[PDB]
């Protein structure tokens, strides 16, 4: 299948409570594999998936240098952005960055990503060309001009097409038994009357990986988008994910409703009904 690597950086100021915290986590698809936290007692890059543990001390030290350097640079960046928005030194602010590469099923680069946010809003992003920028506002334009002057895009491109795909492929091979295994959802339909004249049908999907899934109800073969209650896909804690979709139906019409499930781990989509 297709696979991606992402790193997620969060830098958070906290005036009066020390210097800004910097935390980085790395993922392959929906599997986290490293973390770094400047607030740790002894900050260092730590493994968070078994297949990354085989990397040698050189790797851990390299990561640790990178994240310690970022920790310092993001503190400067937070100072800079506070000033770009004329903000007081009183408030707490957050810079986020998410970046990485996507591979297609043949292992070739599909595209790179590099986006940043300030206080939860788009700030600046690298365009799909990996050569030009999109700035959200006049403050982000200052960053854009600074990064254009320093040929930053060229650095990002070199990483996204280079080390990013090379290391992602390495991880995919080292963790192939899990990273390249799709576990299908285990499914069932439950039934709970809500009154004499209505009942809830809930369609469950459990134990699936990766997180991407489509779960829908149909009535007489028509999608029930507006009438369906969907919960956000949620982690089980064992690598797998869970989701349900529910609809309230007239008592006695239960068999007119079908639950449909699509998932990478499924050869053919499922159609399920309540089975009293």
């Amino acid at each position: 299948g297709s696979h991606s690597m992402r790193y997620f950086y969060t830098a958070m100021s906290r005036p009066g409570r020390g210097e800004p915290r910097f935390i980085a986590v790395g993922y392959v698809d929906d599997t986290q594999f490293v973390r770094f936290d400047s607030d740790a007692a002894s900050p260092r890059t730590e493994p968070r998936a078994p297949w990354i543990e085989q990397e040698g001390p050189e790797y851990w030290d390299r990561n640790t240098q990178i994240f310690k350097t970022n920790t310092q640079t993001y503190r400067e960046s937070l100072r800079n952005l506070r000033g770009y928005y004329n903000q007081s030194e009183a408030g707490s602010h957050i810079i986020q960055r998410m970046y990485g590469c996507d591979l297609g099923p043949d292992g070739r680069l599909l595209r790179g990503h590099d986006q940043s946010a300030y206080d939860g809003k788009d700030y600046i992003a690298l365009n799909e060309d990996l050569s030009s920028w999109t700035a959200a506002d006049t403050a982000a334009q200052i960053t854009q001009r600074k990064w254009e002057a320093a040929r930053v895009a060229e650095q990002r491109r070199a990483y996204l097409e280079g080390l990013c795909v090379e290391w992602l492929r390495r991880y995919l091979e080292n963790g192939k038994e899990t990273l390249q295994r799709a576990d299908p959802p285990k499914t069932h339909v439950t039934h709970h009357p809500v009154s004499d004249h209505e009942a809830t049908l809930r369609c469950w999907a459990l134990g699936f990986y990766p997180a991407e899934i489509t779960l829908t109800w149909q009535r007489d073969g028509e999608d029930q988008t507006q009438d369906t209650e969907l919960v956000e896909t949620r982690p089980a804690g064992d690598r797998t994910f869970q989701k349900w979709a529910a609809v309230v139906v007239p008592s006695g019409e239960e068999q007119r409703y079908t639950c449909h499930v699509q998932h990478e781990g499924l050869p053919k989509p499922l159609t399920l009904r309540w089975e009293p």
């Binding site: 790193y7 980085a24 790395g26 790797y59 390299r62 990561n63 240098q65 990178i66 994240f67 350097t69 970022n70 640079t73 400067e76 960046s77 800079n80 952005l81 810079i95 970046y99 940043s116 700030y123 600046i124 960053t143 600074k146 990064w147 320093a150 930053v152 650095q155 990002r156 990483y159 080390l163 990013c164 290391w167």
Partner: peptide
């Protein structure tokens, strides 16, 4: 592996 970040080189926002 994250984007390399050579000491002193990193361009801030």
């Amino acid at each position: 592996l994250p984007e390399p970040a050579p000491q002193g080189q990193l361009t801030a926002y």
